[model samples]
Target: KQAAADRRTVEKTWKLMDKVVRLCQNPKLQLKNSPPYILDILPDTYQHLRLILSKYDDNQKLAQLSENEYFKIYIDSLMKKSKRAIRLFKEGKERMYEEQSQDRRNLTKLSLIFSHMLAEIKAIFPNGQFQGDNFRITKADAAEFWRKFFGDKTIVPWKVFRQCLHEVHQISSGLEAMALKSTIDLTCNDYISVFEFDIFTRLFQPWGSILRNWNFLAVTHPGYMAFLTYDEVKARLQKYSTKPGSYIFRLSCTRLGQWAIGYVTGDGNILQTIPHNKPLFQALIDGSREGFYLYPDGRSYNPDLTGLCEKVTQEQYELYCEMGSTFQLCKICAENDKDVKIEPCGHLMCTSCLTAWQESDGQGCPFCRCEIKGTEPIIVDPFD
Candidate 1:
């Protein structure tokens, strides 16, 4: 009887593992590419591996300097979870070999899902493979993995992920500079475009957490399957390329412009896929000549000249005046809007609008050529 009971447990565990394994083989299962339903199940597989990697160590090289203190706590919890799961996996494997059940087939599928992800992770770092075929991944392995993902094209999946990172970094930096003189909130589309956009209907990918959340949403609402059917890239292009009603084409151009600036600047902090700034960047790469202007209003442009240049023409100087200074209404924005500030070069606009633009678009101050780090609204003024 005891043996029979063990058999049943084996069946359930096997089924689950089988599904996991199949998922790993799926190209779409990448943290960023997987649909919402797939994301909902990722935590389960992730939990198992994290458990192994968690107990490795506490990296205190920077001590309190690290902004994410919870990283340590999170790691510890994963270790405990991994140890328990390993025991369960072994027991189920033992049961399967002793007395096979149809359910064991399912577990086989899931077992490989984690294996695939681990394989991919190892491929990225190349040093993560365990000496034996087991769930354990070392601290050196995890650290290497994290570092690679930060920004570098030396690996596979990471190569694609870096594009997004580059975009995010640029947007954040630009927003900071713009905020010095603007009153806008600076968070309009970043939240929506970068995080919530659906994968089937969207072109880009969000960060891991945001990607997971988006997948979870799709899982809950399977009805979205219909939305993607007619949402082909070609159809989307046609609709957006027209005008007025075509926010898609317009959005693509804007995002492309932002991305180009980020790419040229070599910043890496892409927020996510749906965000307008992100798409605008991609659109620009694909061919979107939507205007490009420096941030500070008073700054003069000599495209022939590089970086930040002074205007050579009276028209240019007058245009700079029209752009105005930080104390007055922004060049693109007007006085009726009281919540305004200017970029260092003096272009003025509503703080909220400019901030949103910067977060979704800019990399450096459009006007003064100053780094946003030196001038933007200081977020740490109070947090510090």
Candidate 2:
């Protein structure tokens, strides 16, 4: 009986405190609210310093906390995409209501919350051009915006986001949440962009949604690029009079993320492409190495010399590899640096390996599958 009394005492006080904790209403959240952090308890104990939000479709405060503007934008965007998700969410009627006197679980509701937060975020960053049409900003600026939405100073912002990514919504990705320090560190290593962050996160959601394969048009159509379409580049190329210094550069439709250079050689309009991973502006700066100088339309390559995409300077590019030359690498032979730019397409490979490869796939360039006419690779010293 004494042992039972001890257990009852522990249980009685715990139940009493929890009752008070869960009963009080938070005016802001418009719900039965939180556990106090100071020497007491908290309600809906999750992320410590996040703004508490009501469920996207919670019933308890039906009229109190609804009408989030971000949620409206998200629904309309989803409706444009096949509409089955909006249709299927009809199936989520009783499945996603929470914070509980009786029933508690919120996944689909969090799907809405997730998108709302993303829309809220998308609004925070204005498309400030580092140049025309291209954009990027520090990660902390974005991180600070997410925290401010909750109006908290000491929150582990991404910690709560991770729970939503996993527990609340179940798109099932390996995106483990970032640590507070890690998030700040990434601010230096990688800058965030409107498309890369806000619109990018718009691509993920709970079980009712998953939209990846970022629109190809979004990247190249009026997106930090010189020309509009492949057709324009093709049509524009033949119309130009071929002179020795003639060259025109544009983002390539064939090579996906790579840029293409069309220049007049004895062959009329010969095409050269920069590798997809390399920056185009810097590639243009180095274009003189391969005899690409003036634009075919009478413009000098040295004019204005800037681009809308991210620029990786020759010095900073060294951080990516020990040898300062990013293109000088040869996958075939670890011992020797590749010394040839295989013609008809942009490729660099050891001549010995090129023959070994040519003996077979020169069939096509590992670069763009263009046939290398039975000739050997060219050792252009301009490549330094």
Candidate 3:
């Protein structure tokens, strides 16, 4: 019976390793196109190999394997995989903007999707960076909270209705757990003052007005396609072009926190990088004189731009980008600064943001949903 059990182990390990090895081969696998944090797979794979090695001693057939074979499996592949991972990580780091924009865009694509996993998530964040009354989670806290919620499990196929997550979009719940973990783990080395945890959950919160609506643009407006290399934009425009004035606005490929505009003339797709300081909406309003159709569908332009966005000249925009300013970013609108303090809850956001979504006697905080009690204006000091 013991020999039979050992044989089953050999069978299982062999099959898994075999499948993994097949995928590792060059079946048109474009490594450059992959996410940078994919390199984190190195450690998990290394551990799997170590576990397989440990099993060699327990099974006679495995034990008979040559020393040369063992060294190639353990020693050779170890450094090889590590070096690949290191190179990919740096390549991915350089493409961080595209990576993160893709991450957010992925969430938008998920608009057509769960809550129990959500309840537990709230149990994780519970509070914001002391924003009004809403919950906020820093990136560091997300790691610990993920462990607290998901860390312990060994013998469960999954009762994840509330206690577990199952049948997420396509992949199993466990894979998404790794994705969420990786999503948080592989970010730039900076503190996230306000971390957005749920791309899915924001739809229900009061934040849905600001976050779900604008970021929700990605969820709905495929026209606002942002996270692509320049070549991709060129190719995409060609397929849907012929109109001289046709154009698409997107997040900048080169600039960290900026945008770019690509146009399709009668000749070909032309690329124009938006200056760093110009807000995207403003770019859309002022940049084009003749109204043109949207890229794919040839739909009418979505603009109230002449009224909505204020006219700011290149000179002012330049100073705005170069100026020393440390106002905590308003979660409502990236372009504005927080001027009013939501009392008792202590949430701070732009005055216009508060007034725009002001709850008369209803829930006071747009975020915390905490009861609105008071508000006060505060001065913003630069050079923080």
Candidate number achieving the greatest lDDT relative to the actual structure: 3
The model with the greatest TM-score is 3
- The TM-score values for the models, in the order shown, are 0.20, 0.26, 0.31
Candidates' C-alpha lDDT: 0.29, 0.34, 0.38
What's model 3's lDDT at 363? Answer: 63
RMSD to the true structure for each prediction, in A, is 21.4, 26.0, 21.1
| Cα lDDT of model 2 by residue, 19-113, tens digit | 43343222322342211121122221211111222221244433322232222222232222112223322444443233431112222222222
- Candidate 1 C-alpha error for residue 82, in Å: 15
Off by over 4 Å in 1: 1-34, 38-44, 47-286, 289-384
Model 3 Cα lDDT, one tens digit per residue, 208-299: 13222233233234456544556677777776566655666554322323456677665655655564443344455554544433342234
Candidate that beats the other on TM-score, 1 or 2, i.e. the better one: 2
Pairs of residues clashing in candidate 2: 34-43, 35-41, 35-42, 35-43, 36-41, 247-296, 361-364
lDDT of 3 at 104: 25
Predicted candidate 1 versus true structure: per-residue lDDT over 80-189, tens digit per residue: 22332344344555443322442233233233233333333333323422222222222333223334553222212212332443444332222222221121111111
Model 1 lDDT, residue 17, Cα = 46
